[PDB]
Every structure is written in structure tokens, then in C-alpha cells.
Design a binder for this molecule. Structure first.
Ligand SMILES: CC(C)CCC[C@@H](C)CCC[C@@H](C)CCC[C@@H](C)CCOC[C@@H](CO)OCC[C@H](C)CCC[C@H](C)CCC[C@H](C)CCCC(C)C
Ligand SMILES: CC(C)CCC[C@@H](C)CCC[C@@H](C)CCC[C@@H](C)CCOC[C@@H](CO)OCC[C@H](C)CCC[C@H](C)CCC[C@H](C)CCCC(C)C
Ligand SMILES: CC(C)CCC[C@@H](C)CCC[C@@H](C)CCC[C@@H](C)CCOC[C@@H](CO)OCC[C@H](C)CCC[C@H](C)CCC[C@H](C)CCCC(C)C
Ligand SMILES: CC(C)CCC[C@@H](C)CCC[C@@H](C)CCC[C@@H](C)CCOC[C@@H](CO)OCC[C@H](C)CCC[C@H](C)CCC[C@H](C)CCCC(C)C
Ligand SMILES: CC(C)CCC[C@@H](C)CCC[C@@H](C)CCC[C@@H](C)CCOC[C@@H](CO)OCC[C@H](C)CCC[C@H](C)CCC[C@H](C)CCCC(C)C
Ligand SMILES: CC(C)CCC[C@@H](C)CCC[C@@H](C)CCC[C@@H](C)CCOC[C@@H](CO)OCC[C@H](C)CCC[C@H](C)CCC[C@H](C)CCCC(C)C
Ligand SMILES: *C/C=C(C)/C=C/C=C(C)/C=C/C1=C(C)CCCC1(C)C
Ligand SMILES: *C/C=C(C)/C=C/C=C(C)/C=C/C1=C(C)CCCC1(C)C
Ligand SMILES: *C/C=C(C)/C=C/C=C(C)/C=C/C1=C(C)CCCC1(C)C
Ligand SMILES: CCCCCCCCCCCCCCC
Ligand SMILES: CCCCCCCCCCCCCCC
Ligand SMILES: CCCCCCCCCCCCCCC
Ligand SMILES: CCCCCCCCCCCCCCC
Ligand SMILES: CCCCCCCCCCCCCCC
Ligand SMILES: CCCCCCCCCCCCCCC
Ligand SMILES: CCCCCCCCCCCCCC
Ligand SMILES: CCCCCCCCCCCCCC
Ligand SMILES: CCCCCCCCCCCCC
Ligand SMILES: CCCCCCCCCCCCC
Ligand SMILES: CCCCCCCCCCCCC
Ligand SMILES: CCCCCCCCCCC
Ligand SMILES: CCCCCCCCCCC
Ligand SMILES: CCCCCCCCCCC
Ligand SMILES: CCCCCCCCCC
Ligand SMILES: CCCCCCCCCC
Ligand SMILES: CCCCCCCCCC
Ligand SMILES: CCCCCCCCC
Ligand SMILES: CCCCCCCCC
Ligand SMILES: CCCCCCCCC
Ligand SMILES: CCCCCCCC
Ligand SMILES: CCCCCCCC
Ligand SMILES: CCCCCCCC
Ligand SMILES: CCCCCCCC
Ligand SMILES: CCCCCCCC
Ligand SMILES: CCCCCCCC
Ligand SMILES: CCCCCCCC
Lengths: 231, 231, 231
């Protein structure tokens, strides 16, 4: 484990995702509202999945070597197995908050799968220049997601209860800022141009992951928007 | 790329799926009917997924070598990753058109997963004679799907609006004819008996894919069956 | 095939899953109740999936070698591909029986995916002591599932029709007893401590699989709880 300088950030990430999972699990014990139960189930699964994948990276299972640039490059593939399941769950939290229609939910989840799937292909591609073709396709899929979150959901939240509109607006802004950083870290990190070393890259993804999952969840599960209007 | 004679058909397929995706995306911009939005989302995702997998084959990522018959045989595995997601989406288009019940939808999607999954196992199997055992199981799963589309959905469409009944009947006939060709191309192509060479096999799958996805989508999204009855 | 002593139990399992699939398929022909159709579709898919994965193990495709303990250990990875899809389908049978809320269904299916996913990682892990870390995480996920089936569903079934309450109680008890045996067989078998040899381990999993899928299905599909109350 300790033979890799980035191990400290993988261990911290593992701990923070595990602690986040347990807090949400305990906090959700005393909840019977069927609407609130939906948000607790979605939001608790997110850091639980991330916990297992951070642990796999810490123990060395989620790491492979990819030859490109005449070098064997360490690629943590477990990140994409994490994101494949956690990013659509996070979008479902937002879509259920605004009572989005089914067709829009399917478009979001499908574009998200394309985003993560093409990012994985780009991470494992051995022809250096082709890695950035996949990065560009994946980034186009992300821009579609961000467009929908702004010019489809925002207008839908305003016609909703005030507390669900204000909570959505906050979580929307958090998501757009944090998610946009991921393609940048990829491009300048060891998967892309190799400007930033792997140990610093790992620290950046850990800050982003914890903020986008545990920070996101703390804002959502403390809001009254997750409960139905009741007397 | 150009070192493979089949590259021209992979490049054409990539272009036609990309163009198809963009047309459906633009055409769906001016749509607010929640029913129509469902069909546009399903139908636009189909060629978008196929685009990415054709590109992976063009660039050489979606290709592996499988030893059988005393030879290293080029097997494009990316086809099955495509079909795993696009064939159930196409069946969902048909099932939603006739307002099929949930139990029937699950049976269709499950049989479809078995069809594609066993076809993938057959494509990667190293014992030559066993490849055709998997082909037979996969073909049995397809025949179940075709039976349901005829002796379960057809009777359901007649009790529906006339425009949804006539549109379903057309898309049903297109699907049964085109899908039935796939097991035949597999059997006589490089995955099976090896009668037809890979470059011709690739041309045939490209014609079938574009017809079953973009041609299918053009018929559906030009129909009024996708809109609810409104004044 | 016959070069492996466990082949006899893989062949028996294949036959019993295939026969089970055909019986459920025939029995479900004469069913039009939309509620009953749901249970028949879920319950017939379970042994059909298991059939294909037992066949892959029989023919040698679903087997790999994992080095640990200074030895190349035969690991049947196809079991986890089976369980990944069949265990959530079995939980869906139970959840639909008691009309569970959506949030609870998602929590069950998500915990089940974590259970199977971490068990697969543990089966393929090359550092011997780490294999049991994954076993423990997977077992914690199972205990969560069992808790929900007892202290969330049981109370919900009592407020239901008497026949659905008594049928659920029976299937609940069958599930908790049979599922609990799996982590024990893993721990003492070739994936874990290696006390029980592989051929005996394979026999035990076959008895458990057939009971948990075909036996489970025979109890459910003979009950009147799967039909709506009708005159
Ligand atoms: C009902 O809706 C509320 C349940 O949602 C919340 C239910 C959760 C979604 C269930 C998923 C958690 C499982 C219990 C998994 C247990 C293993 C975890 C990875 C444990 C990690 C923390 C600890 C080991 C440090
Ligand atoms: C509606 C939305 C959900 C739609 C989703 C969008 C999606 C279509 C976007 C594209 C996804 C696609 C790129 C997934 C590729 C997975 C692949 C990286 C797995 C590893 O295989 C890659 C190479 C080794 O580098 O295999 C070496 C050769 C091996 C012999 C490969 C044989 C196994 C194949 C991988 C079998 C295909 C399985 C499916 C891809 C499983 C789904 C994986 C997940 C990442 C989507
Ligand atoms: C709301 O419902 C309508 C949206 O459906 C339609 C929405 C679509 C389903 C969203 C999926 C498309 C994404 C925007 C993916 C973008 C990358 C594409 C693969 C681009 C391919 C064409 C071009 C690069 C040649
Ligand atoms: C309700 C419906 C959706 C049900 C679906 C029906 C489905 C059950 C039908 C059978 C599907 C099954 C054959 C999928 C097999 C995937 C497999 C080809 C992936 C590549 O692995 C094959 C060998 C190399 O040749 O791995 C070499 C050895 C490696 C060490 C393998 C270890 C990884 C395992 C593959 C882990 C299992 C992952 C799941 C199979 C992922 C789903 C893939 C998709 C193709 C279903
Ligand atoms: C409508 O709801 C009822 C259909 O459910 C029941 C429908 C089933 C869920 C459909 C799935 C079965 C498919 C027909 C697959 C056929 C291949 C099987 C694996 C055959 C195995 C048995 C035989 C080959 C020994
Ligand atoms: C809501 C719920 C459904 C959530 C589900 C819970 C889930 C997150 C729990 C953890 C699942 C995770 C451990 C799955 C790992 C699959 C992995 C074993 C496949 C084989 O790859 C392992 C190594 C060889 O030993 O690959 C060698 C290196 C290769 C180069 C690997 C590159 C391919 C990657 C495997 C791509 C990721 C694909 C996804 C993991 C596909 C889903 C598989 C299924 C088992 C979940
Ligand atoms: C909890 C994890 C989250 C919210 C991860 C989000 C990840 C992304 C938005 C990743 C995007 C990428 C691109 C847009 C292209 C480059 C490759 C990716 C996958 C890093
Ligand atoms: C857009 C792609 C489509 C509609 C693909 C359809 C593919 C099939 C219907 C494939 C069927 C197969 C068999 C029936 C057995 C032989 C292997 C397959 C997977 C080619
Ligand atoms: C039809 C198959 C069924 C119902 C299989 C159930 C399997 C389990 C409940 C497996 C559980 C495991 C653990 C709890 C940890 C050890 C590894 C597993 C996956 C065997
Ligand atoms: C979206 C965030 C990207 C900003 C990356 C900042 C990295 C600064 C760290 C110093 C770079 C290390 C280079 C010298 C080793
Ligand atoms: C009462 C609110 C705080 C509860 C404690 C939460 C502990 C989980 C770890 C959170 C750290 C990361 C927060 C986002 C920066
Ligand atoms: C379902 C369509 C299958 C028909 C295949 C027709 C192939 C004819 C092309 C000529 C065969 C090439 C053999 C000589 C190289
Ligand atoms: C107005 C209808 C035609 C629009 C142009 C569609 C261009 C997408 C490519 C379609 C070619 C394949 C059609 C099926 C044979
Ligand atoms: C949950 C069931 C686990 C019980 C396992 C009993 C196995 C007894 C078979 C004899 C053990 C073989 C050891 C000598 C070869
Ligand atoms: C009339 C009920 C029996 C029908 C025959 C079922 C045959 C399928 C194989 C069942 C054997 C396994 C039963 C569970 C132990
Ligand atoms: C194995 C991959 C299957 C999933 C394909 C994605 C489409 C799923 C459609 C689900 C239809 C709704 C069923 C109720
Ligand atoms: C990782 C594979 C999980 C999918 C298994 C297929 C069954 C899914 C059941 C979904 C139940 C409906 C939830 C609302
Ligand atoms: C185009 C939709 C408007 C909202 C999206 C904001 C774009 C942020 C740019 C992200 C940069 C990634 C490289
Ligand atoms: C048996 C259901 C009737 C409709 C299915 C038509 C069968 C077409 C044969 C396809 C040939 C594939 C080898
Ligand atoms: C803790 C929830 C109560 C019901 C679960 C029964 C636990 C059975 C123990 C299984 C042993 C697996 C190692
Ligand atoms: C080795 C660098 C080659 C540059 C390729 C950049 C491709 C980016 C595509 C974005 C449209
Ligand atoms: C090398 C050819 C061996 C023939 C096997 C055919 C199997 C087909 C099974 C269809 C029932
Ligand atoms: C080689 C045996 C090492 C023992 C590790 C046991 C780990 C079990 C963790 C359960 C909390
Ligand atoms: C609940 C605390 C979980 C912390 C265990 C993971 C941290 C790795 C320490 C080496
Ligand atoms: C929108 C046009 C997309 C065409 C790019 C793919 C074709 C491959 C050319 C080499
Ligand atoms: C319907 C009977 C299915 C039996 C075939 C599988 C058994 C393997 C025999 C070698
Ligand atoms: C993106 C930063 C999240 C901050 C988490 C703190 C929330 C406390 C209510
Ligand atoms: C299967 C052939 C499809 C033909 C596509 C043309 C549709 C234009 C309306
Ligand atoms: C767990 C044992 C199941 C027994 C199956 C027999 C059911 C006949 C109704
Ligand atoms: C009005 C809410 C502002 C939230 C933005 C937070 C950016 C990290
Ligand atoms: C909408 C604000 C985008 C912020 C992008 C930050 C990328 C590091
Ligand atoms: C009555 C519609 C006929 C459609 C069949 C088209 C076959 C390619
Ligand atoms: C229902 C007509 C089937 C046509 C099969 C064509 C196979 C090449
Ligand atoms: C295995 C075939 C079953 C025969 C019919 C059983 C009575 C519905
Ligand atoms: C009251 C029903 C008892 C069922 C338990 C069966 C254990 C195999
Ligand atoms: C609730 C009874 C548990 C039985 C466990 C059996 C494990 C072999």
C-alpha cells in the first residue's frame, strides 16, 4: 500500500466515504415519509458505492497499467466503475426533486452513461492522440447534461413549492461547478497531458468526490424539500 | 486504421450513426408533449450509443483476437456492447407504443439480454463446436421475442388508436425482418462457419444496423402516434 | 469437461435449471391477469439466467485461475454474473408481493449489488488476507438486506390480504435460511479457507441455487397471492 505516494489520499477518501455512509444511514433511520425515503435511499447508496471503490484503489485492486507515450502508466480504472453508478444516482436526486418527466430522466441517465463510458475508453486507449478524441466526446455529453439542468429543470423548479425550488437551485449550482472540474483534472493529469503528477491528481479527485457526494448529500438531506407537504 | 480492409464500412457506419443522432437531436428540440419526449429520448440514444461503438471499432479498440480453428480470429466485441443497450431500447419504443404491461416489458428485456449475452459468449468461445451451442440458445431467445411481438402486442395494438396501430404494425414488420438477418450473418461470417469474409460481413452488419436504428427512428418520429390525443 | 471432478454437479445444475425454466414457461402460458404476469416474468427469468451460467461453467468458459497461497486456484467467476442479476430479481418478487415503496426497493437492490460486487472482488483478489476483508463487507450488505426483509416488510405484509401475508412469510423464511448459507460455503470453500474441496463446494452451491430459485418459484407461482382480488 504505502509504496504508492498517493496512498494517503486514497485512505482519506475511503474513511470520509465510509463515515458519510454511516451518518446518512443513521440519520435515515427515523424516516417514514415515502417521499423522504426515496431521497435517503438514493443519497446513502452514493457514498457506499464510492467507499468500496476507494477501498479497491487503496488495496491495489482497482489499478492497472496502460502503455502509452512509451511508458507503463498507472491508471485507476475503479474510478469509472464508481462514477458509472453514482453519477446517475446523483442526477436522479435532482430530477425527482423537480418531478421531472420520464423522457427527460432517460435522456440524462443515457447521456451520463455515454459520458462515463467514453471516459473509460479514453483512459484505457493505447494510442496517445486518440485518448483526447474520447475526452472530447465525453465532454460533449457532459455539456448536454449541464444544458438540461439549466434550460429544462430550472424552469420546472420555479413552478414548484418554494423550498424545493430554492434547494434545487443550490444543488444545481454545486453540481455544475464541481462536475465541470473533473474533465479538467483528467486532461492535465496522468490520464491526459501528464502536467500534474498522479499523487496531486489523486488529491484533487478526492476533494471533488467528497464534496460532490457527501457535501451534496448533507445539503439535500437537511432540506425540507424531501418531505411531502403534510399537516 | 486503413490496414484493415473493413475500415471503409466502419467509417461509413460511424458517419451515418453520428448524422442520425444529430438529426434526431435537432428534430426533438421543439417538442413539449411528455409522451413524445419519451420516444425522442429513447430513439435518439440508440444511434448515439451505436456511434460510439462504431468509432471504437474504427480506431481498433473494440477488436480482439480469439484462437479457434488453429487461427487467431479477429472478433469485434464492441458490437455486443452496442447491442446490449440499443436492442432493449428499441423494444421499449415498441412496447410503449402499444402501452404494454410491465410484466411483458420485463420478459422482453430479459430475453433480449440473454440473446445478446449468449451471443457474446459464443463469439469469445475457443472450442469451435461450442460456439454454435451458444448461437442456438441465443436464437431461441430471439424467437421468443419475435413470438411476443406477434402474438401479444399485435392484438394489443388493434384495441388502440388507429394511428398507433398502423405505425406499430409497420415498425413490427421492419423489426422482425431485420433482426432475423443478424443470426444468419453471424453463422456464415467470421464468428461462425467463415464462409463470408470479414470485410463483407462488416458491410452487412452496417446496412442492418443503420436500417434497424436510423431507418426505424425516421419512421417512428415522423408518426403522429407518439403524441397524445390533444385538441 | 469430465476432466474436472465437479463436472457432475455442474451438469445436474444445468439440467435442473433448464427443466425449471421450461415448467414455469409452460405454466405461465395460460395467464392474463396483469399482476400475475409480473410474477411469472420475474420468476421465469431467474432459472433461465442461471441455466446459461451453469452451462458456461460446465463447458469451462466461466472458470479462471487466480494465484494466491502460492497456487493457481480455480475460481468459477460465472457464479457472480448469475447472482448479479438473479438475486435482485428474487428480491423484487418479495417486494412486489408486499407492495413495498420505491425507496425501499432501491435500497434493497443497491445493497444487493454491493453484496455481489464485493464478493466478486474478494474472489479475484490475489492478496490472501484481503479476500476476507471483501467477504466481511459483502456479509454486512447481506445483513442489511435480511434486516429489511424482517423489520420493514413483515410489518407491511400483515396489513395486506391474508393470502399474500402467509405466502410472503413462507418465502421470507426460505430466503433468509438459504441465502445465509452462501457466505458460509464461500468462507470454508476454495474461495476462502480451503477446508472443503471444490467438488463438494460445487455440490453445495448447486443444492442452494436450485432450492433458492426453482423451489422458491414453485411456492410462489402456486399461490393465489400473485393474482389480484377479482370476482
Ligand atoms: C428505506 O429507505 C432508507 C434506506 O436507505 C439507506 C439504505 C442504504 C442505501 C443501504 C446500503 C448500505 C449497505 C448496508 C451496505 C453495507 C456496507 C457499507 C459499504 C458499509 C460502509 C461503512 C463502514 C464499513 C465503514
Ligand atoms: C443507456 C446507457 C446506460 C447507455 C450506456 C452508454 C455506453 C454504451 C457508452 C459506451 C460504453 C462502452 C465503452 C463500455 C466499454 C467497457 C469496457 C471498457 C470493458 C473492458 O474492456 C475493454 C478491453 C480492455 O481494455 O477489453 C478487452 C477485450 C475483452 C475480450 C472484452 C470482452 C468483454 C466486453 C467488454 C463485453 C461488453 C460488456 C459491456 C460493455 C458491459 C457494460 C460496461 C459499462 C462500462 C457500460
Ligand atoms: C427531453 O427529451 C428529449 C431529449 O432526447 C434526446 C437527448 C439525447 C438522448 C442525449 C444523448 C446525446 C448526448 C448529447 C451525447 C453527445 C455525444 C454524441 C455521441 C455526439 C455524436 C454526434 C457528433 C459527435 C458527430
Ligand atoms: C435481466 C437481463 C438483463 C439478464 C441478462 C442476461 C445475462 C445473464 C445473459 C448472460 C450474460 C453473461 C454471459 C455475460 C458475460 C460477460 C463476459 C463476456 C465479460 C468478459 O469476460 C469473459 C472472459 C473472457 O472471455 O473473462 C475472463 C475472466 C475474467 C476474470 C472475468 C471476471 C469478470 C466477470 C465478467 C464479472 C461479471 C460481470 C457481469 C457479467 C457484467 C455484465 C456484462 C453484460 C455482458 C451482461
Ligand atoms: C408475459 O409474461 C409471461 C412471460 O414470462 C416468461 C417469459 C420468460 C422470462 C422469457 C425468457 C426465456 C427465453 C425464451 C430464453 C430461451 C432460452 C432458455 C435459456 C431456454 C432454456 C431451457 C432449454 C434450452 C433446456
Ligand atoms: C446500484 C447498484 C447496482 C450499485 C452496484 C454496486 C457496485 C458498485 C459494487 C462494486 C462493483 C465492482 C467491484 C465491480 C467490479 C467488476 C470487475 C470485477 C470486472 C473485472 O475486472 C477486474 C479486474 C481483473 O480482476 O480487471 C482488470 C483490469 C481491467 C482493465 C478492468 C477495466 C474494465 C472495468 C471493470 C470497467 C468497469 C465496468 C463496471 C464495473 C461494469 C459493472 C460490473 C458489475 C460486476 C457491477
Ligand atoms: C462522485 C463523482 C462524480 C460526481 C464524478 C463526476 C465525473 C465527471 C463529471 C467526469 C467527467 C469526464 C469528462 C467530462 C471527460 C473526461 C473524463 C471524465 C470521465 C473525467
Ligand atoms: C441495432 C442493432 C440491432 C437491432 C441488433 C440486433 C441483433 C440481433 C437480433 C442478434 C442476434 C444474434 C443471434 C440471434 C444469435 C447469433 C448472435 C447474435 C447476437 C448476432
Ligand atoms: C440464486 C442465487 C442466490 C440466491 C445467491 C445468493 C448469494 C449470496 C446471498 C451470496 C453471498 C455472499 C456473501 C454474503 C459474502 C461472501 C460472498 C457471497 C457473494 C457468496
Ligand atoms: C480544476 C482544478 C485544476 C487546477 C490544478 C492546479 C494544480 C496546481 C498544483 C501544482 C502543480 C504541480 C506541478 C509541479 C509538480
Ligand atoms: C451536523 C452536520 C455534520 C455531520 C457530520 C458529517 C460527517 C461526515 C463527513 C463530512 C465531511 C465532508 C463534508 C463536505 C466538505
Ligand atoms: C441475410 C443475408 C445473408 C446473405 C449473404 C450473401 C453474401 C453474398 C456475398 C458473396 C459471398 C462472398 C464469398 C466469396 C468471397
Ligand atoms: C427528411 C427525412 C430525411 C432526413 C435526413 C436523415 C439523414 C440521416 C441519415 C439517414 C440515412 C439512412 C436512412 C435509412 C436507410
Ligand atoms: C452451510 C453448510 C456448510 C456445511 C459444510 C459441511 C461439509 C461437510 C462435508 C465433509 C467435509 C469434507 C472434508 C474432508 C474432505
Ligand atoms: C407439480 C409440481 C412439480 C412440477 C415439476 C417441477 C420440475 C422442476 C424441477 C424441480 C426440482 C427441484 C425442486 C426443488 C427441490
Ligand atoms: C443488461 C442491460 C439492460 C438494460 C438496458 C437499458 C434499457 C432498460 C429498459 C428498461 C425498461 C423498463 C422495464 C420496467
Ligand atoms: C447491477 C445490476 C442490477 C440490475 C438487476 C436487474 C433487476 C433490476 C430490478 C429493478 C427494480 C426496480 C427499481 C425501481
Ligand atoms: C452549455 C450549457 C451551459 C451550462 C454549462 C456550463 C459549461 C461549463 C464549462 C465546463 C468546461 C469543461 C471543459
Ligand atoms: C415463432 C414466432 C413466429 C415469428 C418469428 C419468425 C421467425 C423468423 C425466423 C428467423 C430465422 C433465424 C435463424
Ligand atoms: C440482523 C438482522 C436479523 C436477521 C438476520 C439473520 C442473521 C443470520 C446470520 C447469517 C450468518 C452469515 C455469516
Ligand atoms: C497528441 C495531441 C494530438 C491532438 C489531438 C486533439 C484532439 C482533440 C479533439 C477535440 C475536437
Ligand atoms: C463443428 C460442428 C459441430 C456441430 C454442432 C452443432 C450444434 C448446433 C446445436 C443446435 C441444436
Ligand atoms: C490470513 C488471515 C488474516 C485474517 C484477516 C481477517 C479479516 C476479517 C475482517 C472481519 C472484520
Ligand atoms: C468507519 C471508519 C472507516 C475507516 C477505514 C478505512 C480507512 C483506511 C485506514 C488504513
Ligand atoms: C458529423 C460527421 C461525423 C463524421 C466523423 C466520423 C467519420 C470518420 C471519418 C474518418
Ligand atoms: C431440457 C434438458 C436440458 C439438459 C441439457 C443440459 C444437461 C447437460 C448434459 C451433458
Ligand atoms: C460543496 C461544499 C459542501 C459544503 C457541505 C456543508 C453543508 C452543511 C449543511
Ligand atoms: C427499413 C428501411 C427504412 C427506410 C427509411 C426511410 C423512412 C423515410 C420516412
Ligand atoms: C426450499 C425447499 C423448497 C421445496 C419445493 C417444493 C415446493 C412444492 C410446492
Ligand atoms: C446561491 C447558492 C450558491 C451555491 C454555489 C456554491 C458553489 C460551490
Ligand atoms: C458555471 C461555473 C463553471 C465553473 C468551472 C470551474 C472549472 C474548474
Ligand atoms: C405493411 C408495411 C410493410 C413493411 C415491411 C418492410 C420490410 C422491409
Ligand atoms: C418474417 C419474414 C422473415 C424474413 C427473414 C429474412 C432473413 C434473411
Ligand atoms: C416440462 C413441461 C411441463 C409439462 C406441463 C406441466 C403442466 C402445466
Ligand atoms: C412457516 C414456514 C416455514 C418455512 C421454513 C422452511 C425452511 C427451509
Ligand atoms: C434464521 C435462521 C438462520 C439459519 C442459518 C443457517 C446457516 C447455515
Amino acid at each position: 500500500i504505502t509504496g504508492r505516494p498517493e496512498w494517503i489520499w486514497l485512505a482519506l477518501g475511503t474513511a470520509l466515504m465510509g463515515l458519510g455512509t454511516l451518518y446518512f444511514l443513521v440519520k435515515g433511520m427515523g424516516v417514514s415519509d415515502p417521499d423522504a425515503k426515496k431521497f435517503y435511499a438514493i443519497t446513502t447508496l452514493v457514498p457506499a458505492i464510492a467507499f468500496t471503490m476507494y477501498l479497491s484503489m487503496l488495496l491495489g485492486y482497482g489499478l492497472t497499467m496502460v502503455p502509452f507515450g512509451g511508458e507503463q502508466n498507472p491508471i485507476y480504472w475503479a474510478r469509472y466503475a464508481d462514477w458509472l453508478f453514482t453519477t446517475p444516482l446523483l442526477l436522479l436526486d435532482l430530477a425527482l426533486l423537480v418531478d421531472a418527466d420520464q423522457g427527460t430522466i432517460l435522456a440524462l441517465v443515457g447521456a451520463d452513461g455515454i459520458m462515463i463510458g467514453t471516459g473509460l475508453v479514453g483512459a484505457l486507449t493505447k494510442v496517445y492522440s486518440y485518448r483526447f478524441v474520447w475526452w472530447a466526446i465525453s465532454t460533449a455529453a457532459m455539456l448536454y447534461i449541464l444544458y438540461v439542468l439549466f434550460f429544462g429543470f430550472t424552469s420546472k423548479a420555479e413552478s414548484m413549492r418554494p423550498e424545493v425550488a430554492s434547494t434545487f437551485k443550490v444543488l444545481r449550482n454545486v453540481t455544475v461547478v464541481l462536475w465541470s472540474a473533473y474533465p479538467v483534472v483528467w486532461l492535465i493529469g496522468s490520464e491526459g497531458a501528464g502536467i500534474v503528477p498522479l499523487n496531486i491528481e489523486t488529491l484533487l479527485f478526492m476533494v471533488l468526490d467528497v464534496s460532490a457526494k457527501v457535501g451534496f448529500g448533507l445539503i439535500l438531506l437537511r432540506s425540507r424539500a424531501i418531505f411531502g407537504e403534510a399537516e
